[PDB]
Amino acid sequence: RSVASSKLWMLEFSAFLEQQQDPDTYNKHLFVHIGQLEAVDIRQIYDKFPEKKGGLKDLFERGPSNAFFLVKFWADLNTNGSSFYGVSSQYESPENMIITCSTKVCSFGKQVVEKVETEYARYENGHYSYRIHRSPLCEYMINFIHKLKHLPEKYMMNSVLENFTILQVVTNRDTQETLLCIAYVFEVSAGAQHHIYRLVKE
């Protein structure tokens, strides 16, 4: 129970490339994977995320502070008929809610793509499960992965990645409460690895 507020726990998160050799043969590569915590001062990352109305600082100040996380990924780019780039995630909550998951892909602290998905609950052992299964990776991300892999050295990939962040905000659509807010930072793995941090006010 690492990426978890008092109302929502993100159990799994993975981004992948699945290749179909033929109708019965599929190969799947995981770029990043969280499956089944030191604090970081959130002011140290404000300039890497959008800061207009509804930006990271506004969201954090609105709270609850226990819903904010920073994930550092070391992504596995060591890959390769028909290709599919996707993201899958699973959440649990004691409450039955309508959740909206917004994912903002950011370049130099500015939003370039936003993906919005609405999810409903499935009852599971007295609690509620939410699943975003095989959500398609946007063209910007697919072309970014391609451009990254074509660089001749991993330190150049890490340099490019200094100005690339992703902000995921999961909200209760009816009350507008922030259930989880996860800031993502990346490096290339020299398998895929991660560290999860709690974002705090100081």
Omega before residue 136 within 30° of 0, cis: no
Number of residues that bind ligand MYR (CB under 6 A): 15
Using the contact rule CB under 8 A, the part of the chain among 17-25, 56-64, 104-112, 168-176 near a copy of itself is: 17-25
Q: Which of 64, 56, 39, 124 is CA-nearest to residue 90?
A: 124
CB of 36 to a copy of itself, least distance (A): 13
Size of the site for other proteins (CB under 8 A): 39
Residues near 25 by Cβ (< 8 Å), separated by ≥ 6?
none
69 near ligand MYR, judged by CB under 6 A: no
Contact 2, 196 (CB under 8 A): yes
Quick check: bond before 50 cis, omega within 30?
no
Nearest Cα residue to 79 out of 156, 12, 15: 15
Token representation of residue 157? 């990939």
Of 4 and 17, nearer to ligand MYR (C-beta) is: 17
CA 140 to chain centre: 15
Please give the residues from 24 up to 63 whose contact with other proteins meets the rule CB under 8 A. Answer: 38, 40-41, 44, 47
Binding segment for a copy of itself (CB under 8 A), chosen from 23-31, 102-110, 143-151, 172-180, is: 23-31
Distance CA 135, CA 18 (A): 13
Total residues belonging to the chain: 202
Residues contacting residue 84 through CB under 8 Å, at least 6 positions apart: 17, 18, 19, 20, 134, 136
Q: By CB under 6 A, which span of 20-28, 46-54, 117-125, 136-144 interacts with ligand MYR?
A: 136-144
Binding mask 89-128 for ligand MYR (x = CB under 6 A): --------------x-x-------x-x-------------
Beta bridge partners of 186: 73
Amino acid at 8: L
* Residues within the interface to ligand MYR (CB under 6 A): 15, 31-32, 75, 87, 103, 105, 113, 115, 137-138, 141, 145, 166, 186
Per CB under 8 A, residues contacting other proteins are: 38, 40-41, 44, 47, 72, 74, 107-108, 111-117, 135-136, 138-140, 143-144, 147, 151, 156, 159-160, 162-164, 185, 187, 189-190, 193-195, 197
**Interacting residues toward a copy of itself by CB under 8 A:** 22-30, 33, 76, 78, 120-124, 131, 191-192
